[PDB]
Amino acid sequence: EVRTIKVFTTVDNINLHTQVVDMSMTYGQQFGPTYLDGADVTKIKPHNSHEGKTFYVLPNDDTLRVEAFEYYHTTDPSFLGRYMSALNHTKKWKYPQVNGLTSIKWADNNCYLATALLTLQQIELKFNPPALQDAYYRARAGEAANFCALILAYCNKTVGELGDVRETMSYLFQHANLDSCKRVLNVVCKTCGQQQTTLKGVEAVMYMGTLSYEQFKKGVQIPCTCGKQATKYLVQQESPFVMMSAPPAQYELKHGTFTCASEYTGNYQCGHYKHITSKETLYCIDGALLTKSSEYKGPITDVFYKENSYTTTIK
Ligand SMILES: NC(=S)N/N=C/c1ccc(O)cc1O
Ligand SMILES: [Cl-]
Ligand SMILES: [Cl-]
Ligand SMILES: [Cl-]
Ligand SMILES: [Cl-]
Ligand SMILES: [Cl-]
Ligand SMILES: [Zn+2]
């Protein structure tokens, strides 16, 4: 006897596609690679309990290609399988609310993802891909499994791999609307004179080399092409935040002078991030763990500051 069930296939979990499947054949033989809420069911034959359920598939016809691109804003052929593989793990993580924010209980080297997620909830940022819009909304509400899996897929990191917070933020910023953001810098060399530069989008909100927004406004020393040392300072800034980053170093964080920051303890090959947020006092969120202090010193690698419009007085 021939036995079938009805299931739906999807690439975006919104647009469904009716299918009839043969219970004597695997999903793989019928759809190609197939997933059920992250689980790889490619080598599995249909079960009775599968009737009416939704399965993710790869974009193997033009309708799915268009639906996948519109939702994710990527055409990397291994994206969906990387997203499903991550999701099968992130759906098992825990997402406690810590001081009003969605955090992540430590697992699988995910400390960099927790600090990133905590940071996002403290800065003004809108994502462009619908997939990230929808999953970030759920994450803010507490159900961050899809959002975390998407970050991993977009950053090309697997669960368990050690991640860098600045790189992760660069990827997310690439998929956000920062088109309004503008930065003007000036560089002064005693032998070469001056040169001004204007930066836009992601490059207007990120800086690598110093943690201090004030020192960026006063000036910082960088090499020049003659061998001289030149000074770079911030001429104009238009953005709702800025991110200052540097190799980890002992640094003092003062209440009320920054929004939030990342601390990294360890070495190049492995280590651990924690998150510091400046509220009524200084809170350190380490996954599910929370402590407080009136002052803070530690190896800081990123600091986030509020902004709207700044213009220098330097002449
Ligand atoms: N190539 C064309 S026209 N669209 N494909 C979209 C697409 C493909 C693979 C994938 O994993 C995610 C996607 O958004
Ligand atoms: Cl896991
Ligand atoms: Cl927990
Ligand atoms: Cl959004
Ligand atoms: Cl204070
Ligand atoms: Cl600030
Ligand atoms: Zn020079």
UniProtKB/Swiss-Prot annotation:
It comes from Severe acute respiratory syndrome coronavirus 2. It comes from the Viruses. A zinc finger (C4-type) spans 189-226. Residues 2-57 form the Ubiquitin-like domain. It is a multi-pass membrane protein. Changing T75A: Partial loss of ubiquitin cleavage in vitro; no effect on ISG15 cleavage in vitro. Changing T75L: Increased cleavage of ubiquitin in vitro; no effect on ISG15 cleavage in vitro. It catalyses: Thiol-dependent hydrolysis of ester, thioester, amide, peptide and isopeptide bonds formed by the C-terminal Gly of ubiquitin (a 76-residue protein attached to proteins as an intracellular targeting signal). The active site is at C111, H272, D286. Zn(2+) 4 binds at C189, C192, C224, C226. It is found in: Host endoplasmic reticulum membrane. This is Papain-like protease nsp3. Residues 71-315 form the Peptidase C16 domain. May form homohexamers. Interacts with N protein. Changing C111S: Complete loss of PL-pro activity. Inhibited in vitro by GRL-0617. Responsible for the cleavages located at the N-terminus of the replicase polyprotein. Participates together with nsp4 in the assembly of virally-induced cytoplasmic double-membrane vesicles necessary for viral replication. Antagonizes innate immune induction of type I interferon by blocking the phosphorylation, dimerization and subsequent nuclear translocation of host IRF3. Also prevents host NF-kappa-B signaling. In addition, PL-PRO possesses a deubiquitinating/deISGylating activity and processes both 'Lys-48'- and 'Lys-63'-linked polyubiquitin chains from cellular substrates.
